[PDB]
Structure 1
Amino acid sequence: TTTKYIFVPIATIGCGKTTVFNTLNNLFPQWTHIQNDNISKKAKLKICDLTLLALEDDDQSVVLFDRNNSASRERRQIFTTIDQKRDEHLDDTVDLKYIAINFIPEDLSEEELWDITYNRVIQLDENLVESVMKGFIQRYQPINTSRSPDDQFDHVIHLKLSKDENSLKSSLENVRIIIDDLVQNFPDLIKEKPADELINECFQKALDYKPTFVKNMTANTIKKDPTYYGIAMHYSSILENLEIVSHNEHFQNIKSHIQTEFHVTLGHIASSKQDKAGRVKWKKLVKTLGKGDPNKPKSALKFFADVKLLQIVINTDKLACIKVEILKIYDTNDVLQSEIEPINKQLHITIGCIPPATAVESNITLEELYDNPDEQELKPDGTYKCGDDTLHVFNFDNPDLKLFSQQLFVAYQ
């Protein structure tokens, strides 16, 4: 009855796995070539799943299982995974021969292995390729058919690997080795050997196809986005305007947690994730105010703001903050920048927090105080119960607490 085949490389990167498998598939289009490099790291159906799917139909007899399997545990994973899922995909009467294709001769030096493969991969990335490649060689364990797991292979084909600038290419010799092996040992797979002209042509095609790299080597950069955009507030100017609450009994808790810098937050990356509104406003902030130098926790930007201090709100035993308004934002030549829209409704300067609570809670404090969209006027002095918080409101006597030319900054935390 029916026999199916899984061809399993034992290899490191650049040994010619994909070239050899692409040559064979060019000659035998009914075979299925599954490339682990082209499977998402987060794919629900991984190579063992796709291998079994590609063996279900009768006409599908061969999978070229294109993965390094450098470590002995990775060969064990093939057997145990396919053992467990096989009965969902194949009749009980089927084998399932596993043919190991050994790409690294047992007497190849580690330094010649590196010299052959590293230089093949070169010839738009420089040394990301060295650490990913050395990782596969680090954990490479040669085939050992005298013990598990490699003693579970039904057959082993031993390939050549060498510098070949003056000889037949080693992957073409290897295609010939595989074909001759199959013709002698599995005539049902290859009835008659294809013509050498055809084998050579198919190999040339495969030798010139766009290469495929493991995804950690084609791993793109994270064009990192900053954590938040702020207005740096002149320290002594904020401190001097705390005198309105300095003697208040509900502020004495807060005094020992007063911050050593004050800022108005314009936008935090976390808010790009609540609304479409929060996303769009975050993007426009990154567009207008650029990504400053990213190897510094704070970078000043060439924009400045005028800010008016409106009232102090104490969230009892939690924090104190100043509700503010931004009068204007402008650049170094004082032209107004109308396109800078803050994300937070309820703009504020956090003063200090009692350390169960954190500065992010200044927003919830002012939002719960000003929760009615049709009543946003400054509330008069006094105590306000909001949810489970007791708030105290202190309006400034001076209607003209304007702070000018406060410089914007970007923050990466």
Structure 2
Amino acid sequence: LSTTTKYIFVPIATIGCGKTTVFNTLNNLFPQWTHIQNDNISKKAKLKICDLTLLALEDDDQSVVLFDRNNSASRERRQIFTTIDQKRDEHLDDTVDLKYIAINFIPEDLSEEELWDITYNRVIQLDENLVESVMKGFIQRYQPINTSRSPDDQFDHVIHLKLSKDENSSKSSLENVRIIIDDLVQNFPDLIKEKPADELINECFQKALDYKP
């Protein structure tokens, strides 16, 4: 109406950290949010994920883009800011406030050994040697978020997730969905007025967990 705010949720993650499960759960709770999955976009597609993001932020309808890519490498976050900042004036008028929220899927204190152990067994449980090999490449390129310097200092806010083996029958992606919701209620009350009920979060996560694409 007068000064609408849009949000782009940028994961920093490697394969199998739970990005799509968490974003699917969120989309299941908030059907108006736009979940754009890089895995669904051809490498020779006319519109790539950055183009599809801006297109999915034009209407007064569309406030949230779930940007579903690993962005394990620093340059992959730089691309997002530069490309979107650079094409924003093509589509959005000067009343649109755009915020980038990092969703950090890999704790600061996690070792590569435990990162590998958790994500690899998630994904195995499709030549086996080449799925392993692609996962390794995203880990080799992984540069932890560093909001003290370019480009990560352009984030408006960071949400720190956990990456654990499941304990006490609590999947860490479900723990992570709750963190994101609690964080948004606190720090962006206009995005989520009041929480979904706990059982609706559980059911929406159950839907995401048992998704067989």
1:42, CA displacement in angstroms? 0.2
Q: How does 1:298-313 map to 2 (within 5 A)?
A: none
Structure 2 CA distance for aligned equivalents of residues 149 and 124 of structure 1:
34
Structure 1 CA distance for aligned equivalents of residues 117 and 157 of structure 2:
29
1:94, CA displacement in angstroms? 1.2
1:20, CA displacement in angstroms? 0.1
1:206, CA displacement in angstroms? 0.2
TM-score scaled by length of structure 1:
0.50
Question: In the TM superposition, what whole-angstrom CA distance separates every residue of 1:229-258 from its partner, at most 9, and x where no partner exists?
Answer: xxxxxxxxxxxxxxxxxxxxxxxxxxxxxx
Question: In the TM superposition, what whole-angstrom CA distance separates every residue of 1:284-326 from its partner, at most 9, and x where no partner exists?
Answer: xxxxxxxxxxxxxxxxxxxxxxxxxxxxxxxxxxxxxxxxxxx
Structure 2 CA distance for aligned equivalents of residues 2 and 164 of structure 1:
38
1:155, CA displacement in angstroms? 0.2
1:81 corresponds to which residue? 83
1:48, CA displacement in angstroms? 0.4
Alpha-carbon RMSD across the aligned residues, in angstroms, is: 0.8
Structure 2 CA distance for aligned equivalents of residues 140 and 166 of structure 1:
30
Question: In the TM superposition, what whole-angstrom CA distance separates every residue of 1:321-374 from its partner, at most 9, and x where no partner exists?
Answer: xxxxxxxxxxxxxxxxxxxxxxxxxxxxxxxxxxxxxxxxxxxxxxxxxxxxxx
SS in 2 for 1:173: helix
Which ranges of structure 1 fall in alignment gaps of 5 or more residues?
210-413
SS in 1 for 2:66: strand
Q: Between the two proteins, what is the percent identity of the paired residues?
A: 100
1:249 corresponds to which residue? none
1:124, CA displacement in angstroms? 5.1
Question: In the TM superposition, what whole-angstrom CA distance separates every residue of 1:204-227 from its partner, at most 9, and x where no partner exists?
Answer: 000011xxxxxxxxxxxxxxxxxx
Please state if 1:102 is matched with 2:104: yes
2:203 corresponds to which residue? 201
SS in 2 for 1:93: coil
SS in 2 for 1:188: coil
Structure 2 CA distance for aligned equivalents of residues 73 and 144 of structure 1:
12
Distance 1:124 1:36, change over 3 A: closer
Q: Which residue, 151, 154, 158 being the options, matches 1:152? A: 154
- In terms of fraction of residues, the more strand-rich structure is 1
Structure 2 CA distance for aligned equivalents of residues 41 and 2 of structure 1:
32
1:176, CA displacement in angstroms? 0.2
Please state if 1:8 is matched with 2:10: yes
Which ranges of structure 2 fall in alignment gaps of 5 or more residues?
none
Aligned length: 209
SS in 2 for 1:117: helix
2:120 corresponds to which residue? 118
Question: In the TM superposition, what whole-angstrom CA distance separates every residue of 1:8-64 from its partner, at most 9, and x where no partner exists?
Answer: 000000000000000000000000000000000101110000000000001100000
Question: In the TM superposition, what whole-angstrom CA distance separates every residue of 1:100-123 from its partner, at most 9, and x where no partner exists?
Answer: 000000000100000000000011
Q: How does 1:319-358 map to 2 (within 5 A)?
A: none
Structure 2 CA distance for aligned equivalents of residues 162 and 170 of structure 1:
6
Structure 1 CA distance for aligned equivalents of residues 164 and 187 of structure 2:
26
Structure 2 CA distance for aligned equivalents of residues 124 and 30 of structure 1:
34
1:166, CA displacement in angstroms? 3.9
Structure 2 CA distance for aligned equivalents of residues 199 and 34 of structure 1:
21
- Of structures 1 and 2, the larger Rg is shown by 1
TM-score scaled by length of structure 2:
0.96
1:165, CA displacement in angstroms? 5.1
